[PDB]
Symmetry: C2
Subunit: 665 residues, 2 copies
């Protein structure tokens, strides 16, 4: 209605005197640690309830109706879990037997420590690729050749099919433990802000570029070509050229059968997603395409007749726990930090999506402990890093899921897939398992459709997407993530180093000040020039502030004072023989400043001192309380630069100048 | 006097309608690039005058007294410069003549391209230390041994004093050429903000660590001990331990002479600095101590009698230009970048100091181009990277210097030294030259006295000093600088990621809003809770903003709605059979925001939508125009979230809320 106020001009001291401050809280280091560490039994029950979330949803279960919905989702997710679990094992260069272990043991551990209800912990295509990247680098194929077979001229150094996998499993187990330990450090030290640096364009471009490396890696299994497992700079680029050079040594039985299930699985997935209003339960195309593949491959001897590529290496049994090979963490610490941060990023990403739909809150630090113990327990049973795939997550959710009981039932299907089931999957072609992974790449391949949308939005965030996408292609995949985090943080520094400074003016007959580069009918005070400077001054943008002040006043505070003394020497000699016109004051509207960075405040006092020699006052308008208290501690208020130079609002600074000129001509 | 206003409550649209905006300037790339490149001869003359500043100060000379001032400053600066060059030649592991070379040609090159008047370009202790470090890393001593001399049992692999100096000089010349190329690239691309990242505490800690390493190296040289030129991690600690282990294999005469000249030089420097009011011209302690050392060392055969360490390797002549061995840049690019940036930082610091002391202006890009051309010209004459030492610079300023003519005269001394002066310097002990370097370390060793001062000041900047000082000691010296810049950028990001949020309240009978954690007698509106959030929202501080909102409203917008929906299903079943109390609105005083990082504006819109479901309006107070224009493009103003939700000032929102409560109960 009517916005009218009437108060005196409290600049800095007319308001600080009659306003009593609040005494700050004392540190009291002796008692601070005592009050923090609680001794009551209620705190002991609270830390156990959070650490073990199973004690919350289990007592209040709904066995009446939940048991019917969990038994149907467990057998549905179990069949998809035992297939996607063994399919993702090829991305880690590990035998297909250890892929099923990643779908049974991590579920058992993510039952008494997990804080989610609609998350199916298991393998992941992008995560398994980063695991397989360090296996090929630290244990290539040309490192296990054995001379045996009485060759023609030289020693017969045939392939090492057999004991070669033993070094790959132990290497992947050491990586699994080191990833789990890092996740426990994040949960133990209660540091969760380290994963906030993974922005949406950063994680979006990373998963998009990772889909290309997954497509190239899986295409090698489909085409049945033998590459040289290149790694380093241009890893995906070099291996893509080698694939085109070895096209002649392909297998038509694998390409035709591999491309067939690609079109079938993609069509059924697209048909079921579009016509969702008529069929609520998604058709398990992953399961029906595998059962029919093993049946056809069992009739005709695809291994002998067509010389196809089958598994024929499933022993159908468990294995004793193997202690991790401690001592190889020096050459894997750099890559483990990249795998441990993407396993948690996707865990929270998929978790929060299915959290607002079921209306339940997911703890942040608890997921670090949940997946931390999961990866550690998985390392003792020859498993790789566990995560939650978005496709497998939607299986137990769309079919009907309430708690992790359905996930435990999903582990029973994998349980029988280790002892009894597995012999029937012997003649299954490797191209079939290498095709269900490519079908799930549609979600990440369609993520490129955001670049035209992000360009119309904030352009700096669109560059981060393209930067992370290209950098995670040239210099590997794990190194590209670290190059994306540094580039994303650098973009934040570049946005605060080059602020958006304006020529703030006054709206007639009011007190609201708007920029002069946006509005025309604005009147500036006679002589006074207002300047606003966002992105608080630090050591890097303190030089830009000088160029900012020199551009809004028209002159330079240094060159003007130098020309004054250059002409002053003519005055002291003429008696022996015989610019700064418009700028009267400078009101700095530093209202968007948060910190000081005393390294830069030393030049801030110099600005007030330089303009003081040329009779130009430098006033302040909207300095906050947390900043003014910081200027006093940094040695700014001397005998000449008093607090009266500062003001509370922007209009008080202009009103103080108009009253000073009227009272003093 | 009286601050009174009377205007309607223009929130967002009551002000944007009747206020016509200014049309932004069109891009017009063709005309923009056409208007940028000027064709008139005036712009050509201007850029020629700027690129070659020699054409400016030459026509306005003051020969009458400037001739005498420049000749005396030139002889003094030439003596000081040849002494500092023959001293710093040992820091670069190069023979002593190449120091004199590097003290002659850079001076000639910094005459037609430099834009300063009181800068004596030459060697530098830190730069020479870095050059020597990278030379020892890329060319150790055990890589040149030759088996010759018919030893006792094995081949006599004597030391290679001699032919290895050619390789060392070639490596130093390649390094200097690469540094010059990097500086010319930085100057041509007009990129000057890259050196603004070197804050005052960062460069202070770097200079402190460099002074410590220089002290260690000069103590190694004085004690005449033979180390193993360790490099890498903890190199200074390892070489100090090796020195302490080889104390017995020293020379008592050399150590005594070094300690004596150190004490004498320090005492004379202290006496001249303290009693400056009586003697304006500083006593050249370096010149007299070198003269007396050469006089004493020439009497007795210190090389034969006391087995002292002398130079005896001065050919007293020039050398033809040698083309640099291009191809060794991939293993020294980072070191060259570090050397170039530290040299430019020190040069700009000295220039700004001696320019604000003499009241003249110095350009940045022109100095960059000048030093780049100087290093390039030095690379073609077997010289190392040139800079401006603070001690040598103060000589020509205290003795009286006006233009670079004194610098050109300062090269005449080095000119006659290259040919004639230096044959008498044959029996001079190396410990004497290794002492003035330690004597000049007093300025950098006293820089540690700022840590107690910076701790009372901004503590985050005090940590950067200690972090840079320690990190530039453990992992070399060049790598410590890169670890310091990244640490400073991370500290800047942490200050904008964890803002200082408050509980802003209202002062009675006024319109100024202050924090509630600082003032006691403050009244908040009935139900309304004002919140201020500095450090504008980006992808990393969004969870921080969520936590801040949840802490300032007392509840969580998610848990409240979850409990409401959990209690709602009890209502729909009871008819078949038979928190958010105080918070009325949320005025976000986002006045300290500059950018919004649309990745974060999505979560902001999500927050606004979530609080709408619980009947809690989220209003804005001080959103700038540059932020609203960004939110409009980032898809924020839908059919429901209109612009009326925003306000211009903080009191307007409270007034609108009170009017709505009064008109609608």
């Amino acid at each position: 209605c009517s916005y009218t106020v009437s108060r005196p001009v409290y600049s800095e001291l007319a308001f600080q005197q009659q306003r009593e401050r609040r005494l700050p809280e004392r540190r009291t280091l002796r008692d601070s640690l005592a009050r923090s560490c609680s001794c009551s039994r209620k705190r002991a029950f609270g830390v156990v309830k959070t650490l073990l979330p199973i004690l919350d949803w289990l007592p209040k279960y709904r066995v009446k109706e939940w048991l019917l919905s969990d038994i149907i989702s467990g057998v549905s997710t179990g069949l998809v879990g035992t297939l996607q679990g063994m399919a993702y094992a090829l991305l880690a260069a590990v035998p297909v037997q250890f892929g099923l272990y990643s779908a049974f043991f991590p579920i058992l551990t993510y039952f008494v420590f997990g804080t989610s209800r609609h998350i199916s912990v298991g393998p992941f295509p992008v995560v398994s690729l980063m695991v397989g990247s360090v296996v090929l680098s630290m244990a290539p194929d040309d490192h296990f050749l054995v001379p045996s077979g009485n060759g023609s001229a030289l020693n017969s150094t045939t392939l090492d099919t057999g004991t070669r996998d033993a070094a790959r499993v132990l290497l992947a187990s050491t990586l699994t433990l080191l990833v789990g330990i890092i996740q426990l450090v994040f949960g133990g030290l209660q540091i969760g802000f380290i994963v906030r640096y993974l922005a949406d364009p950063l994680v979006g471009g990373f998963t998009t570029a990772a889909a290309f490396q997954v497509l190239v890696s899986q295409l090698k299994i489909v085409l049945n070509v033998s590459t040289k497992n290149y790694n380093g700079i241009l890893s995906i680029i070099y291996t893509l050229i080698e694939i085109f050079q070895n096209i002649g040594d392909t297998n038509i039985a694998d390409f035709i059968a591999g491309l067939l299930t690609i079109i079938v699985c993609m069509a059924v997935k697209e048909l079921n997603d579009r016509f969702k209003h008529r069929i609520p339960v998604p058709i398990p195309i992953e399961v029906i395409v595998t059962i029919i593949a093993t049946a056809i491959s069992y009739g005709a001897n695809l291994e002998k007749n067509y010389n196809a590529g089958i598994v024929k290496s499933i022993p159908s049994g468990f294995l004793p726990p193997v202690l991790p090979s401690v001592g190889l963490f020096s050459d894997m610490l750099a890559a483990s930090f990249s795998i441990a941060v993407v396993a948690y990023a996707i865990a929270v990403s998929v978790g929060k999506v299915y959290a607002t739909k079921h209306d339940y809150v997911i703890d942040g630090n608890q997921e670090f402990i949940a997946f931390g113990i999961s990866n550690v327990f998985s390392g003792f049973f020859s498993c790789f890093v566990a995560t939650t795939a978005l496709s497998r997550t939607a299986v137990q959710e769309s079919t009907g899921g309430k708690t992790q009981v359905a996930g435990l039932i999903s582990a029973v299907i994998v349980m029988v897939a280790i002892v009894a089931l597995g012999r029937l999957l012997e003649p299954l072609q490797k191209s079939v398992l290498a095709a269900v992974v490519i079908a799930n790449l549609k979600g990440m391949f369609m993520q490129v459709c955001d670049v035209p949308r992000l360009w119309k939005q904030n352009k700096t965030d669109a560059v981060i997407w393209v930067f992370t996408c290209i950098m995670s292609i040239i210099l590997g995949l794990d190194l590209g993530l670290l190059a994306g985090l540094l580039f994303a943080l650098l973009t934040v520094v570049l946005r605060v180093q080059f602020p958006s400074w304006n020529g703030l003016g006054s709206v007639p007959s009011t007190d609201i000040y708007k920029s002069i580069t946006h509005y025309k009918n604005l009147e500036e005070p006679e002589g006074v020039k207002i300047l606003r400077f966002s992105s608080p001054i630090f050591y890097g943008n303190v030089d830009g502030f000088k160029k900012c002040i020199n551009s809004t006043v028209g002159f330079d505070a240094i060159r003007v004072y130098n020309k004054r003394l250059k002409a002053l020497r003519r005055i002291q000699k003429l008696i022996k023989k015989g610019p700064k016109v418009p700028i009267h004051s400078l009101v700095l509207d530093c209202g968007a400043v948060s910190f000081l960075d005393v390294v830069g405040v030393r030049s801030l006092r110099m600005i007030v001192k330089e303009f003081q020699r040329i009779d130009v006052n430098v006033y302040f308008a909207l300095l906050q309380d947390d900043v003014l208290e910081k200027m006093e501690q940094c040695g700014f208020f001397d005998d000449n630069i008093r607090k009266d130079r500062f003001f509370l609002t922007v209009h008080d600074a202009i009103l103080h100048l108009q009253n000073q000129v009227k009272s003093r001509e």
